[PDB]
Symmetry: D2
Subunit: 389 residues, 4 copies
């Protein structure tokens, strides 16, 4: 019924690296223009831009509208941002699907975008500080990475999964290195070229073309993984080596009906058969993909074994192993081109990020059925089942 | 097909007034609890909570999810935030409608919440300020009230509609006083009692029940309206009197299928017959309701005359007159209980705010057909058509 | 040898009260102008202005220079600021004396000034805050009121003196009340009128003449002294009642040689017979006056019993009691017009503030010999012996 | 009568260079320790530490005291800071000379210190910012570099002198280049080794001994001087090239009577024969040294031509050329080892900085008579005359 006619994403930049001073919407407009060009669709035909974003503070009125306009999307179309944390970028696509499936839109550019580098430090100063020190809060850590309920970092929820699923430090590091090695492999071999649209960083003493994911470590060893001290719990198991990073990027897909893509002579990246969002305990938020993937697979009518390829978001090696262990799919078809540990985790763009990687591999190796899924902070999961035409 | 079984909202509080230190998500949870109680539905049955919010900076991971949890909605359900500026609150309800219509949920608590008082000041300070003065930005003005393209306050876009539609200073003031007078009459008569749910402001030396809209001025004269200097263009026409304020509040609805509401013995507030969202030039953003209501009316198969009641969001007196003048509906059925000039304009909650007034008046006077609509910053407009059962 | 030909001071203002927005150097100039007028000396004749100030941050290059210039003191003269914390106001005068004593100056204006109200909040942001919350620090508490070594507030030092000298809560409160009552009586009787020079608070909707010390409480009860909880040690004895306050003010003296006064027909307020400064352990910094006063007396050739009036600064009741107890002078001739608990403690001015009160009482009651002394943070004291001609 | 028994100064570090994160009081303690060590005098015997500092904001109660204590100077001794801008560091020595000459002290450690790197940004936020943006002020620019009266940077004052004394862009550059080259030669030859005491920068992944002035440029060309744009007046003549810099450092000298040195077996660096400070128009503040040196030479009984070495601080090439031009001393005996354009300008330390270089070259070449002088912001100068025993 509803298809992804085309897709694209920026390289994922490191924290204060390639896109340190690059606002989220500028990344988004580049990806909106890209999906338009790749599908052979004019921006004048786009009805609505839906972009997941978690940290828009200080970027001004509705960055989704700013991205759209700069992308040459007309003023008659509509745009908006949404926040389901890590799940946003993929949910935007599902929400984009719903627009078309209910007859409220024909063509929808959806996905997500995030500049964790440009998230500001903030403080409430309307009441006035008569006396005493006050905190300037990092919006990134407050609004993106710390649980609202139990007050600790997402890495502490990773510890709760690691201890519950008795996943050792050695098992988490081996998965970590495996992610880095696969991701260097898929990089050298050009397997990220299709999906990645170059982004021109507008400078002063020189522009810079970024078309390579700069967070991927090259020649990552097990020895350098085992020496790092625990990043959250000081007698724990999760580290900066086996957790995801702080990153900037954007990613999007162009949605339309299966009839509309056929009219236009477009051969789509895939057909969205079903999606699903489900909740879990915020203490073990890393177990989100388990019920959400299972819900999606139930809507699609598929069993776990029918999947040819899977993109399960690596938020932490503890939670990425747990999802894999519970669902029991073949690990050789999971994150075939590495995952978020190596590639990075631009919160709002992360779901649209892993949708690209899934769609292009499905096209490249001839996979029929595929699934994407991310764990979501606050204790939820989102999933989406794709079938190729 | 899809119905609002029940609804509720907090009193709209002034800037740094009744809810000066009350985070949005607390206001949201009360409204969730209210809509659950008023329908006779347990929090356990709620599949998702979709909350429009514009200024969540500093409030922590996904305030929609915080609102839900504190409301007693279980961990299995889902929750997310979205931003289409003023139109966020009403677009939550259409998006919540879409979930049910597409068979992805059975019950949805949609609406919006806003704490403008708690919107922090910010600045991006990762790079370091090697030397010189910097600016601490007001995330309320920047992210909520300033246009991202031309750089000015929304009041200057109200000046562009005033000069284009040649609406004099005297016409706008008259409309400003009429909104205040209508809203005081509805307040004294208890017409806001149904929709408003009391909110307990948790104090230290005494709690405070807020169940009255404290921004409504009592005994508003034309003379105090005509003495205020222009707020934006110093030789212009728009003022603090004829413009909307900065306000806190929350508003929500409980959505389910028409058959489900019949199963549960619930007599709904109304049936959502259509909606629509459209774009226009950001310079004349106030005109958003003109094409958006026209589209909505076209999707419902209705003519403008068929409407028995209308809520057109008074962002400014210049734009409120323009929409009424273009569409040409009988002005005696528009904002009958007053509007945003008098009541307030909590950005994210405003679309859910005006929905509640429409629904409870439609029920109280026996209006069959009704329409709600808001103008959106960045240059857009949303509209929803409601028919009672 | 050297005499104080004239002196003046502003009413001491409350924290964020009369002088809330009045920069320190404006108060300093008013007082500079005053001592010139009161001695019959033209600003043209002034060689240098020396002003103790502790919290000048954000006021600009060298507030002392700004003070002098606005007083009409000519550009050919020189001016500077100095910081020895609480001692700074009185040490300036001893420093002024030394300029004249060594032939480097004929006419010196010396004293101090302080706007604790206008002390700003600060933070070091040049390196950049890559990630995580940071503190905006209160320069008033950081640079004025916290010990640099042991890291606690001056009130905790006050507790160290309380316990070492076994001074009860009851003893501190009575003293606190005795200061307030003496101070109110001296106010009502007009005894502050000679020393105070009115200050014109330049407003916008009306100027305001401040010439009554506003922090002096009227009708202070022992019962309201007994009920306050301890401000520093939550099981301690020092409170906001028995400690000094946070205040604004300036004060200054006009120095020249005894021969020079006689040439001009001036009858001086006093002859500066000696001064001293001495150090003690910072834990017990309130004990500064004990060895300082003793030293000054030894340099003067005077015994303690030869003094007719004393102004021993009340930073805290605990230390104030200790100094009296150790030195053993007649308490009926100490802070006869009340003290800093009642009057205020504008850190940098405080030493000139107490000189004024000493000098004008000595003239009024015909005391021949007098002594002024303040305890200093970081463990120091300063004393100065005055004799009348 | 009074002599300098010993002296010492840190390397002067670049803005956010070697001491980027080193509080001024750590630099002042190393220099206190040094001057004690170098005279054969124990901290125990030090009566007082007097340190000029202009930007102590955020460092805590009285850095002078903190420096002294860290240096091992005992709690019985006393300590304070003063501010006369660029003059601060040298006036401390004159103020130290006065303590001994009037019998109030026997041994004084005096001089200055400054960490411009660590100067914080501040804002006055007690009243509450109700609404709108506010400025975070750079204390270094506001409180150290901008003129309080006319509101412009010190550099603009430099232009007034350039225009008044008709000093061309070419003449300023040649002077600028010549300071660099003379300073590189002295550096390479070890001529700064005597005066400099190494400073251990405590780190975490290593300590660092800084004992070389890092701001000195090597192989400076006239060409690169000519290409720079005017830093202040955009059609002006003064640049970053020919202006001094922003710098960190400390410097100190140890004073005692000539007899006291004779008793201790010490051979002093020099006798202080006179000093002076004088005022001029703030507009042309760079002319400060002219009347201050003239005054100084008069009190000494010396004509200008008697001087064998001179250290005339280089705040700006324009002013430096002015002072040399007006006073007419042999330019070959002035700043013989280079100056502030090359070495840097740690505002509060600078006057002691230049004392050191004067003192150690007078010893090394056998100059009998010498003179140091600095121009001072707000419109003043200071000068000190030194003779060798
Ligand atoms: C705001 C108000 C009324 C002052 C109050 O309640 O607080 C009391 C407070 C701030 C704890 C107390 O530290 C105080 O006012 N101290 C000033 C005394 C002080 O530190 N003096 C320096 C001389 S050594
Ligand atoms: C150091 C850096 C960042 C390269 C630079 O821009 O230096 C040039 C700068 C900052 C514009 C210029 O104002 C400067 O360095 N001035 C210091 C000279 C100065 O005013 N000293 C005070 C004595 S009157």
């Amino acid at each position: 019924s509803i298809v992804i006619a085309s897709a694209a994403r920026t390289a994922v930049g490191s924290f204060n690296g390639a896109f340190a001073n690059t606002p989220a919407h500028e990344l988004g407009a580049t990806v909106i223009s890209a999906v338009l060009e790749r599908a052979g669709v004019a921006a004048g035909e786009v009805n609505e831009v839906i972009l997941g974003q978690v940290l828009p503070a200080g970027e001004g009125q509705n960055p989704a509208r700013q991205a759209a306009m700069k992308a040459g999307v007309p003023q008659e179309a509509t745009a908006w941002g949404m926040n389901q944390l890590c799940g946003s970028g993929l949910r935007a696509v599902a929400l984009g699907m719903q627009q078309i499936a209910t007859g409220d839109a024909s063509i929808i550019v959806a996905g997500g975008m995030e500049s964790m580098s440009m998230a500001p430090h903030c403080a409430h100063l309307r009441g006035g500080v008569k006396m005493g020190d006050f905190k300037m809060i990092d919006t990134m850590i407050k609004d993106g990475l710390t649980d609202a309920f139990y007050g600790y970092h997402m890495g502490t929820t990773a510890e709760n999964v690691a201890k519950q699923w008795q996943l050792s430090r050695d098992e988490q590091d081996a998965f970590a290195v495996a992610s880095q090695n696969k991701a260097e492999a898929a990089q050298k071999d050009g397997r990220f070229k299709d999906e990645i649209v170059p982004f021109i960083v507008k400078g002063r003493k020189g522009d810079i073309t970024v078309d390579a994911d700069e967070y991927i470590r090259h020649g990552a060893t097990l020895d350098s993984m085992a020496k790092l001290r625990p990043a959250f719990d000081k007698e724990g198991t999760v580290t900066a080596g086996n957790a995801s990073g702080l990153n900037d990027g954007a990613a999007a897909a162009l949605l339309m009906s299966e009839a509309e893509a056929s009219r236009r002579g477009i051969q789509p990246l895939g057909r969205i058969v079903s999606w699903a969002t489900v909740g879990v305990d915020p203490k073990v938020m890393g177990t989100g993909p388990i019920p959400a993937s299972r819900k999606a697979l139930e809507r699609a009518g598929w069993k776990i074994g029918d999947l040819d390829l899977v993109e399960a978001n690596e938020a932490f090696a503890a939670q990425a192993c747990a999802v894999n262990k519970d669902l029991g799919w073949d690990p050789s078809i999971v994150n075939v081109n590495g995952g978020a540990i190596a590639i990075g985790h631009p919160i709002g763009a992360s779901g649209a990020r892993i949708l690209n990687t899934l769609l292009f591999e499905m096209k490249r190796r001839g996979a029929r059925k595929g699934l994407a899924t991310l764990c979501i902070g606050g204790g939820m999961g989102v999933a989406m089942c794709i079938e190729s035409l």
